[PDB]
């Protein structure tokens, strides 16, 4: 959990994103939250990979907010 400004979440469900802008993931994956884009979407990334993109807030259980 290196960066103090990042947030932290766990995927609640599989998320199949429609485009390259969305980051798809599977239930139970940990996600590093980078920013909250609006009321419905985070941008995040998966630790130890190059996966990054947006996904709905309703698909993740938030441990710590991004700053």
């Amino acid at each position: 959990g290196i960066d103090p400004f990042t947030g932290e979440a766990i995927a609640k469900f599989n998320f199949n994103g429609d485009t390259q802008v969305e980051m798809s993931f599977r239930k139970g994956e940990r996600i590093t939250l980078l920013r909250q884009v609006d009321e419905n979407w985070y941008e995040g990334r998966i630790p130890g990979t190059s996966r990054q993109g947006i996904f709905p807030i309703t698909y993740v259980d938030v441990i710590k907010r991004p700053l």
């Binding site: 609640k12 469900f13 969305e22 884009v37 419905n40 979407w41 947006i54 709905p56 309703t58 698909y59």
Partner: peptide, 10 residues
């Protein structure tokens, strides 16, 4: 059940 996916950000 996974919730419906909302419209992307504006």
């Amino acid at each position: 059940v996974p919730p419906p996916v909302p419209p992307p950000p504006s």
